[PDB]
Amino acid sequence: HAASQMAKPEDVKRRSYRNYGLDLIRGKIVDEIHAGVLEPTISKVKSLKSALEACVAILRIDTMITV
Amino acid sequence: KPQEVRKANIIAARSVADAIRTSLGPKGMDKMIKTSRGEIIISNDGHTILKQMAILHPVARMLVEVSAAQDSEAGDGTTSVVILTGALLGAAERLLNKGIHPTIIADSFQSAAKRSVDILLEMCHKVSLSDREQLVRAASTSLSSKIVSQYSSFLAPLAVDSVLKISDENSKNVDLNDIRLVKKVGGTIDDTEMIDGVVLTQTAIKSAGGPTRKEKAKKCNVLLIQNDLALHFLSKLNIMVVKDIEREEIEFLSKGLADLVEEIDSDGSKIVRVTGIRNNNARPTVSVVIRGANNMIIDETERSLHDALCVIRCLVKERGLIAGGGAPEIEISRRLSKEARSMEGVQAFIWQEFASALEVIPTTLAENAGLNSIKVVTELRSKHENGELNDNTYEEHILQPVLVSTSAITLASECVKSILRIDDIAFSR
Amino acid sequence: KILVELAQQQDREIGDGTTSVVIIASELLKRANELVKNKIHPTTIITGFRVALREAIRFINEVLSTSVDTLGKETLINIA
Prior knowledge:
Chain C: Heterooligomeric complex of about 850 to 900 kDa that forms two stacked rings, 12 to 16 nm in diameter. This is part of a larger assembly, with two copies of chain A and one copy of chain B. Chain A is elongated. Chain A is built from two helices and one strand; from the N terminus they run ααβ. Chain A has helices spanning 32-35, 41-59; one strand at residues 64-66. Chain B has 15 helices and twelve strands. Chains A and C meet through helix 1 and helix 2 of A and helix 1, helix 2 and helix 3 of C.
C-alpha cells in the first residue's frame, strides 16, 4: 500500500494497483474483490463512527463514585 | 484546636470543587456516579452532580444550596460558582497561617464583591429590552449546545415575545415558574401555539354529552376537579367539566388565573386553550407548548429552552451584557491588583489574593479545552491591555449575561462566609 | 457497561461487525493511557479523533466503487 498511494494522485500508474486484501484460506495476498469477500459501505461507516462514540465517554470519566 | 476542626472541612470542600472543576464547559470531563438504588447516571451539569452525590459532609452541602439558588436566580453558572467558591477557600489557607481571623476575611469579601460589580458595569454595554434584534441572537446561541440546530431558528422568537409582554418596566425579579413548558406526544418543533391566556396539562371529556367548548365561560360554565351520572346532569345545564387535574398544577393555576373556551387538537393532543383573561390582579401568564414525535425530542428541548429563558431573565433584572469565556475576569484582576495599594493594614493584602482567585475560571476553560494552561492565561493579560472587551468572542457569538457573572461573585461571598464562620460542630438531636 | 449498549446498537440495525467494533474501541483506550506520561490532554485526544473521523469518511468515499469487472473478469462467482 505504500507504493500504491505514491502514483495515485499523479493519475498515472504502471505496476501500482489498489485494493490489496488478505486471504487467510490459501495463505496469500490477493484482491478481495476477486477473492469473493465484499462488504457494504453502510456497515463500515456506522461501525467506525459508533466505535469512537463509546471511546469518548470512557476517556471523559476522571472519577468513579460508588455508594 | 477550634481552627483545626474548620481546616478539616476546608480541605474536604476543596476536594469537591476540584471534582466539579474538571466538568466546567462543554469540553469538560464527565463524572460517573453510581447511586445506592442501582441507577447509573452521567452528565457534565454541576447541578445534577451535587444533587445526586448525597454529600454527608455538613459544610460541603452549602454548595448544593448555592447551586440551587444559582439556577433559580441567574439560571447559569452552577458549575463556575463552585470553582470560585473553592478559590477563596484555597487562598484563605495561607491567611490562617499568618494569624488572620476569618471575620476580616469574610468582611473583606463584601467590599470586594461590591467593588467587582461596579468595575464590571463600567466595561459592560447597557442594552434595553425595546430592541428585539439583540434578544433573538442571544437566545439562539444558547440553543447551539443541543442536537437541534436548524430548527432552533423558529424557537428564538418564541421565548423573546413571551418575556417582552410580561417585562413591562422595573419588574426586578421575574419568576420563570409561571412559564410552563408543555410536553405532548406528537407534532413537530416548527408547530407551536403561544396561547397567552393559559395552557392546561389535561384533555377534555371523551364521553357522550360533554360540550368540550363554551363561549364566555368562568353561573359556572367550566369547573375543575382534583361519576358518570354527574356528567349527564351537567350536560343538560350546558356546563363544561374537566376532571383529572394534576395536583402539581393546583398551585400553578392559583397564580396566573374567559372570553372563549375551545378545544383545538393539532394531532392527538386534544387540548383546551383559553384567551383574554383580562384580570386586574392576575398578570398575563404564558405557557409554552412544545410538540415532538420521539421522547428524546421534547426532553432535550425542555432543558434547552429553559436555559434560554434564564438568559433573558438576567437581562430583564439587570440590563447589559458582556462577552463570556473569562474575558472580564482578567481585567478585574488587573485593576484590583493596582488599587490594592490604596488600602492599608491586613485588608490591603486580601485584595491581592482576591485578584488571583478570580483567574481560576478563565484558566479552567483553557485547561478543559486542551489548550496549554499557563500559556493561554498569559495571552489574556497581554491582549486585554490595549483593547477593551475585543477578545474574538463577539464574532463567535458568545454572549454571557452580566447578572450571571454578578450573581456568581455575590453568592460566592456568602457561601465562603458561611464556611469560615463555623468554628466547630457537635451532635444535636 | 458502555460496550454492552454499543454491541446491542449494531445488532438492532446492521447486525454484523459487532466483534470488530469492540476490538477497535479496546485499542484506542490502551494507546490513550500511554499518552498520560507524554502530558497529552484528553480533550485534544477527543478533538483529534473527531477531526480525523470526518476526514477519514471523505477519503473512504474516494475509493468506493460499484459492481465492476463484469466483462473479462469475474466477481460474484467466487462469493458462492
